Design a protein around this ligand. Sequence first.
Ligand code: SAM
Ligand code: SF4
Ligand code: SF4
Ligand code: CL
Ligand code: CL
Ligand code: CL
Ligand code: CL
Length: 300
Amino acid sequence: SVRLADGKVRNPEGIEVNASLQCNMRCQSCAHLSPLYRRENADPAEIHDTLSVLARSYHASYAKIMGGEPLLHPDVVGLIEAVRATGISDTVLVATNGTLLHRATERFWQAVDSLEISVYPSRMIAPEEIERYRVLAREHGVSLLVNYYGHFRAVYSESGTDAPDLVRDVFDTCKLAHFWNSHTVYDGWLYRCPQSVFMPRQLRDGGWDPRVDGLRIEDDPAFLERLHRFLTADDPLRACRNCLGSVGKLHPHQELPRAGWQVTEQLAALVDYPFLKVCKDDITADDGCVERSLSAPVGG
Ligand SMILES: C[S@@+](CC[C@H](N)C(=O)[O-])C[C@H]1O[C@@H](n2cnc3c(N)ncnc32)[C@H](O)[C@@H]1O
Ligand code: SF4
Ligand code: SF4
Ligand SMILES: [Cl-]
Ligand SMILES: [Cl-]
Ligand SMILES: [Cl-]
Ligand SMILES: [Cl-]
């Protein structure tokens, strides 16, 4: 999907910037493991500098400001403008669980190009407030997407697999690595996915340094080539051996207590093997997590 053109790596999807690693929700199987993270809000100046370096060799269709809950950031509009100023993307998208959206000001609605709201059963957003948000979106020329989630899929385990065939299959079918292109910027490094950077240091055994799976963003004389090779590499990451990619077992969406939130079951027992077969045939196969989706795009 990713191509090299006019001196830059072109991602048809988005570059992901996590405004906040923490969240106000405790969803089971959170892909960013946000329930395990204390407050950590990205610095707009640092993000601007890092993305400015990356943007000389990289362009994406959109920048996705997300994380745990980006509306927890003390100055999300400043972050939005820091990202926009680099020109690394065509548009800027914010993804939120919506629980704090009633506090967003006119500044927020004027700052974003697109808004993605996840609506979860335990924090249901009333349909009249969704309608309020759709009206606000149309008024400010913001493309709106509202996903009503019924299920989540398992994402990781502390007890990883030593079976290379299974890790190969999980990597090959991973939507984050190959279809969604969830390129993630964190602390000056670029990653193929949020799992490879956010899950290793949250293993209670201590894990490992996630930078082994990353690429340092720098003014290297060959940075374009290094970037292209990193983003088109076809070998499983170290983190793959503790991850379920896109084929983890389905479960009803629910929040868990913080105590005991981490997953210890052996990774092989958490694979949805029929779905792994299906995704081996078609990596775009719907994961069955979104029950329904509302889209109100801006067009013309
Ligand atoms: C880290 S979240 C974006 C941030 C924001 N706090 C939110 O979710 O509303 C990334 C997206 O992937 C979805 N997601 C996270 N974990 C998932 C899982 N284990 N299975 C399926 N979808 C998941 C979430 O619904 C979310 O829309
Ligand atoms: S909302 Fe649920 S999924 Fe999205 S970040 Fe917070 S916890 Fe993880
Ligand atoms: S770690 Fe390996 S499997 Fe898990 S998401 Fe990143 S690439 Fe896909
Ligand atoms: Cl996700
Ligand atoms: Cl392990
Ligand atoms: Cl390298
Ligand atoms: Cl467990």
